[model samples]
Target: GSSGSSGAESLSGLSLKLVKKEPRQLELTWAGSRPRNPGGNLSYELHVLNQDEEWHQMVLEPRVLLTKLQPDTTYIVRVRTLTPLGPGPFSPDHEFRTSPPSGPSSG
Candidate 1:
């Protein structure tokens, strides 16, 4: 659907990296190349996609805690920032794999 101006530009040079990995959760951190004049109210958005599904989250911090993920699956995520202007382009895709299924045990 086409609305009025989406209103934003690419926020280049942002850095994204893996933090800690778990069977059901993914931890990732990113920083701003969001330029000056963006602040306190700035919203960082995280987007994650697996071949089977997609998820979006809005975070106040530079880190993302992606939970409820299936084990042994690979995921790709990207980050973008929104300011008074609007949402910028998403960062390049970064991929990570969740830990494999635990061995047979009591449920």
Candidate 2:
């Protein structure tokens, strides 16, 4: 689950991307298209689903980097922003699957 708001200012957009750093781990990165007002705060969240059909969530504080994910597993990710008034609405959800397991290199 996630929440956000453009507040008095109009929000530009939000995005989520999955980066594969290693065979057994992945990095989830979320960003906001709009810049935070001066002295204002911006936040986001990262969610993932395991093979067991379970859901997990993480609070992202301005471009959070999530790691320690299992390899070759499918996951669902999304993000949202918030303002002083309260939470706005959750962003669209995105799904991704990690690479399959790999054996040790011959080197």
Candidate 3:
């Protein structure tokens, strides 16, 4: 009971949000439309690019937490849906900036 056709379909309504951020840490959450057909299971792939211009990928739930990041730095994040067939098109890129560390005031 199997077919060779691909079930992969592009996702819509993709959005990313900065959940939390620290001097050397960042937390991001994303959401997107499910596959056209719900007969099979589906997952997501998260892609991230740091200031070092290195690309990293992860597969998991809807949220991603990044650690050991540089403070006051910028990073790009995106996501895409994955089906049994293949991975869908990547969502639009999102740019985020890490916050500075909390330190004593230098007034």
Candidate 4:
């Protein structure tokens, strides 16, 4: 007889990237890995906080588009993986500043 543990492995190698940004919107992408089950299905959750420290949450996507953001303001974002076991740990926080709105009309 043999004894073995049957538990899901924690995800790792979480990373984030800023895909695109505009005056009032931003697009972000992230990724992670689960060594135990490379082919297993995995979902993700994203968390974002604006300058005011307001938090927002979203589910089931590696890429997210944040709209209605304040121009020239900074925002912090993070992501985590969700497996059959449960929600994994969050990734390191990343900061991004939206572009300032267009200047006054020169016409």
Q: Which lDDT tens digits does candidate 2 get at residues 56-93?
A: 56564645444666776666666666656876556555
Give the top-scoring candidate (lDDT): 1
- In model 3, which residue pairs have backbone atoms overlapping below 3 Å? none
Report model 2's TM-score to 2 decimal places.
0.61
Query: lDDT by residue for model 1 over 1-107, one digit each (tens)?
Result: 34458633344544568788789998888764535664476677788889989888777778888888888889998887776674578887787888778878677
Which parts of model 3 have CA positions greater than 4 angstroms off?
1-11, 32-40, 103-107
CA lDDT, every prediction? Answer: 0.76, 0.59, 0.74, 0.75
CA lDDT for candidate 1: 0.76
Better of 3 and 4 by TM-score: 4
Model 4 TM-score on a 0 to 1 scale:
0.71
Indicate the worst ten consecutive residues by lDDT in candidate 3.
1-10
lDDT minimum window of 10 residues, candidate 1: 6-15
Native-referenced Cα lDDT, model 4: 0.75
lDDT of 4 by residue, 1-107 (tens): 23356422343655778888788999888765445766656677788987666776766778888888888888888888776775678777687888879887757
